[PDB]
Design a protein around this ligand. Structure first.
Ligand SMILES: OC[C@H]1O[C@@H](O[C@H]2[C@H](O)[C@@H](O)[C@H](O)O[C@@H]2CO)[C@H](O)[C@@H](O)[C@H]1O
Lengths: 152, 165
């Protein structure tokens, strides 16, 4: 119901409103975002990233962040909030938590896993074991982040 | 008779891969004991053997699964003529034991995999990963992913009526 080792906290899909975003200190453990369409800007630690389709950004507890949809073509993004002792150990095996921004390559497994987790969560039915399927997918996602963004 | 027997640490309390192995049976030889481990699923890949539990006898062949649960008094023995080969996954955890309550397989502890079953590929993949187990390449994440896949496939292919509480 709430797992300690590996937990899918929340899944969502946001359509940005032109020029609108968020500016706050992250409370949640970890939230990975995948940009499916349009444009927005992520600002962290004095750096600015103009993101587009194929881009990922990750929020971690304690980060002071600003992210805003572009005026002209405001982004759509899929997001997975997750927690757990296993999850935080696996996040330390990827380089993505250095800048907290990355570009998915053409043959990336990451987009299909994030889209599949958000699809499952739309009709979430634990009596049909959708809970097993979301945890399966979270383990797949963390493996794919490590494989595609290794710590060298 | 063990081609493979990889024992893992009880690292996790929610879901843990305890061990993976491959046994080629010796004609007429087997085991007779009270299960100590949480749960062990066996998939028969070739040949024939017999599983005996609670006064029932099952002659198993390729495609068959049998599951051992803590406290079961069991005997399983390779046939004389064409002794079985079987792959096995030992696993534990609070999530694992909750998911086992959603499948009908724990009634007789024996089942037959259908033609289009996902179970054989997952078990064979987990035993293959265990052969060159490398946690620095995150083989630990891969085995847990596969164990979640395995428990999902058991529930999908051997459903029990279940209302989530
Ligand atoms: O665990 C599956 C594995 O069991 C072996 O038998 C062992 C068992 O693992 C152990 O807990 C118990 O104490 O003794 C048994 C041997 O008597 C089987 O040898 C192997 O083929 C698998 O089925």
């Amino acid at each position: 119901k709430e797992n300690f080792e590996m937990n899918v906290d929340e899944c969502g899909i946001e359509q940005g409103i032109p020029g609108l975003g968020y500016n706050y200190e992250v409370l949640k453990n970890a939230v990975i975002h995948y940009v499916t369409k349009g444009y927005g800007t992520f600002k962290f630690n004095g750096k600015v990233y103009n993101l587009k389709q194929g881009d990922i950004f990750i929020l971690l507890k304690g980060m002071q962040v600003e992210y805003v949809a572009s005026i002209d073509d405001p982004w759509e993004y899929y997001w997975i909030g997750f927690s757990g002792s296993n999850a935080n150990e696996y996040l330390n095996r990827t380089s993505i938590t250095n800048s907290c921004v990355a570009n998915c390559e053409e043959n990336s497994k990451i987009p299909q896993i994030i889209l599949n987790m958000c699809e499952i969560s739309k009709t979430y039915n634990p009596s049909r074991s959708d809970d097993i399927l979301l945890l399966k997918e979270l383990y797949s996602l963390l493996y794919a982040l490590i494989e595609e963004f290794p710590k060298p």
